[PDB]
Symmetry: C3
Subunit: 330 residues, 3 copies
């Protein structure tokens, strides 16, 4: 039948056009993918002043709210903290959430199995006017995290400037690229803010804009901390000029249930010596966690991948033809 | 022939059952796999008190033995250290391991090529009553690391509590998951310890339990140092409910030959100003290295992967039947 | 025809030799591959004395130029810094790059929108004899970055010794290997220096050698900063003995356009209490960024990969071999 032959030739032309176009153009068959070596260098620039009751104006600069100072990809930006200054290793009443005692016989000398707050001496001392806690030996007085100020202390850190410097290089092709491209110049970085449509190549990111693009409100996040994931994609074609290689930034919001362990927090201490007595300042920082992930590939024309793709296409063509013949003969 | 037809039908039925089951159900071909964005947040609640010979009791809390304060996945838990306090830059005898001099003419002014402890002045000063070392200009007193206490100073850190907060999200499917599952509640995290059979979902990990599950003794690993690798496999299936998706924790141990470079150690110093003189406290911490690596895949039904798997199965069936027929023909 | 059959037999034996040798040996089809768990431990031994103008001799050791104290794959080695001592919060003039004012009416009370150095009170104070800058509320004095010392301060850090301790383990094969191979002994590491041909197994890496092998000059990387990427490869075959497994160290140079943001730099502060007043020392460190990336796989004989390769070879032989029949027809 002529119609059977027409259908066979149509299927043959379809599969041939497919194997000659799709894998070659969309899948980049004539090209070869290769990994890159990425080193993330982040740099912020902003000032936040937090005024607390009983303490003077606290000045916080880039070195203060950015705890990883060596330029690590994973860094935390301080937004809310609880200040517990002038801690000494001495006897004090333990935190009330650890345990409540009504008499000295209730306390047991030793160390707590879970949430150890100090070396219990077996004495029940009054923590305050109402409740009493077992005396412990440790840094004192114990930090009380119970109260969380609803307004963020470092609320000025919402619209800060975040500069991410990423340099990637492909060892196979020996091509080194950086986030700073030929389109971006010195005067451009001085007056640009990152945007998905307006300024896609501007390396200066706004913290509030980054948090809002991920799908999270900055105020509720900074109130108790959080995690924001930033990804940089370096998908490009080496067949064109190096100016076409431009990094693409995607922001992903990492959030969980607020009923169980809401936000992200941690504690750090600054050890100093004053009046011959070693003292420290403990801060429970509720800050946003920023993680930079870089994943990209580069493809250039090569003989061996092209030949392998041609062979695979010829094989698929033959398989399709023999299968069509088998289906037609029934 | 009837037997040849029976054999061919058996072969085609076998390969059909194969392409139906093994490709779809076993390999999840109809589903679509994507990567996740992982962020690691770790917390340790526990106190360790170390009393040195001739020194007062020293209190070490979460801010002390956890050196990464921001909460990086790679963190070291202090278990044994050597304290050399009151170091100020000065001209003094070098460590005897660097060099031994019998007269002043042996020392040469300059800097050592390898393991340089200071700028040699060219004078041979007695380090102690027996041996003499060349005078250098560096921090003094030179830390002597030869004597490591067999009993671990922070031996109480074996049965501490480690909480790992892992939040992963898939961008293509827009699904966010956290290590805290619906099965785990607030009262469950109060009193639970992670176990391979009893409590697999309890986010509270015991350091000694993690070390013993990897195959290492905590005492020997703490007295000299070591590395423990923790991996979180987020096997997630979007076809079912999100409650069935669950994280799986695997504990691995990284160890080497004890004769060459036993354990893991590092050196850090705390700079302070006392009596108008810049002084520091150097510590050679022998701590266990913990690394968190999260890798997971999610699968959701989709039309295009299903069609591709059906086409691949049809092709495999066709090729197999043709091959079988060729073999039968012989 | 005889020649047609000869050509057919030749093509068949060629594709048979291909499917029996290439996928088996060149691709290691019978072997199975899996990921490893790697932890990077770096430790440097070197001392450099920087005699800054106006200050006494400053001694720098491993606890000084290595900013990651615990130890991470990404670490910075200090080569040049700008010291601003005795910083205290107060009301002082700002930098001229932020803003220049000729009268008190020019300054506006509030905080700068971009590159906010300090809270501007609103009064124009003379920064020096020539120019005047708006008075701010921040750390006093202000760091100046217009003058960069051309001679490297830590120029002695060029030929320091870098030791990398990497422990890899394959959970699929339960084999643990370390960079310290059996060929390397204790006395070997005392005098060896890493080289591409001379000492490939020596774990003592020279900083200048690493910088020069990547393709970058150490002088520019010390003056303005730089980034160097080091990759460790663990490609090995488990069919042989474990002594044949040797780590491969490759150095990559990550550089960008010197006209826009040359090198890598950061700022960190050391908080201390002197005379009852909180003070700090801010350093703009121009250091080289070293990133360690470990990627490797191990191969061991197994029955299932061998059977899959046999089936794939049979399939290819069937497909390719039946193919060209339309061509026999001519
Ligand atoms: N966080 C940021 N906010 C705004 N602009 C930035 C930020 N980081 C870098 N830039 C801009 O990028 C350019 C290149 O930065 P570079 O690496 O030279 O920093 P730098 O000039 O050494 O830092 P400093 O200005 O403290 O000396 C600078 O001109 C600067 O204006
Ligand atoms: N290392 C740990 N050991 C035991 N329990 C922990 C640990 N980390 C967290 N938890 C428990 O998990 C719950 C949620 O933790 P969350 O993130 O709220 O810490 P937190 O309450 O801010 O810390 P803190 O209790 O020190 O203020 C808490 O109720 C706490 O009891
Ligand atoms: N950065 C380095 N430069 C030169 N030699 C090193 C370096 N790191 C380690 N080594 C050598 O490797 C051997 C094993 O090192 P090990 O892990 O015992 O360090 P360590 O002796 O604890 O450190 P320290 O010498 O500071 O006490 C040592 O004999 C040392 O000479
Ligand atoms: C004493 O401390 C406890 C701790 O929970 C608190 O509930 C109580 O209100 C305090 N009492 C006073 C008078 O401050
Ligand atoms: C938002 O950005 C502006 C800069 O134009 C700044 O003045 C303002 O303080 C920012 N908002 C907050 C809440 O910090
Ligand atoms: C700076 O970069 C921008 C990119 O948006 C470009 O439009 C502009 O022309 C550049 N300026 C100069 C002076 O080249
Ligand atoms: C002096 O120091 C050396 C260092 O190796 C030691 O061997 C020796 O015993 C010491 N002598 C005394 C008397 O302490
Ligand atoms: C083991 O855990 C218990 C808690 O039940 C604790 O009291 C004990 O000190 C731990 N052991 C060590 C060696 O720390
Ligand atoms: C807490 O979680 C555990 C999970 O093991 C569950 O058995 C228990 O019922 C939960 N408690 C409440 C009050 O829901
Ligand atoms: C004052 O500071 C400015 C800062 O740019 C500088 O250019 C100028 O030379 C300085 N004047 C004197 C007299 O130091
Ligand atoms: C180069 O290495 C030698 C060691 O033989 C050392 O003496 C010299 O100071 C090094 N060069 C620099 C610039 O540090
Ligand atoms: C030390 O290791 C080197 C490796 O190059 C080897 O040649 C030498 O024989 C070893 N020394 C001893 C005493 O085994
Ligand atoms: Ca101090
Ligand atoms: Ca890291
Ligand atoms: Mg609490
Ligand atoms: Mg030693
Ligand atoms: Mg500047």
């Amino acid at each position: 039948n002529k119609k059977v032959g027409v259908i066979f030739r149509l299927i043959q032309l379809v599969v041939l056009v497919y194997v000659i176009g799709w894998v070659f153009v969309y899948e980049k068959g004539y090209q070869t993918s290769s990994g890159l070596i990425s080193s993330v260098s982040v740099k912020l620039k902003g000032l936040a002043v937090t005024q607390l009751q009983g303490l003077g104006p606290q000045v916080w600069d880039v070195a203060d709210y950015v705890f990883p100072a060596h330029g690590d990809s994973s860094f935390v930006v301080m937004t809310n903290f609880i200040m517990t200054p002038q801690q000494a290793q001495g006897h004090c009443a333990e935190n009330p959430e650890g345990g409540i005692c009504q008499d000295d016989s209730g306390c047991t000398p030793g160390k707590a199995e879970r949430k150890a707050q100090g070396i219990r001496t077996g004495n029940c001392v009054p923590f305050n006017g109402t409740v009493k806690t077992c005396e412990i030996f440790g840094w004192c007085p114990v930090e009380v995290d119970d109260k969380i100020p609803s307004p963020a202390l470092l609320h000025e850190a919402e619209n800060f400037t975040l500069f991410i410097k990423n340099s990637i290089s492909f060892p196979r092709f020996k091509v080194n690229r950086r986030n700073l491209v030929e389109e971006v110049n010195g005067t451009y970085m001085k007056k640009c803010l990152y945007h998905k449509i307006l300024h896609p190549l501007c390396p200066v990111f706004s913290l509030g804009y980054v948090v809002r693009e991920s799908g999270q409100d900055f105020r509720s996040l900074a109130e108790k901390g959080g995690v924001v994931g930033i990804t940089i994609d370096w998908e490009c074609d080496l067949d064109w000029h190096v100016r076409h290689c431009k990094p693409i930034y995607q922001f992903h919001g990492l959030y969980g249930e607020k009923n169980l362990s809401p936000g992200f927090n941690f504690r750090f201490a600054r050890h100093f010596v004053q009046n011959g007595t070693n003292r420290r300042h403990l801060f429970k920082v509720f800050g946003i966690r920023f993680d930079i992930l870089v994943d990209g590939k580069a493809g250039k024309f090569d003989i061996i991948p092209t030949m392998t793709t041609i062979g695979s296409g010829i094989g698929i063509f033959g398989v399709a033809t023999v299968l069509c013949d088998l289906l037609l003969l029934h």
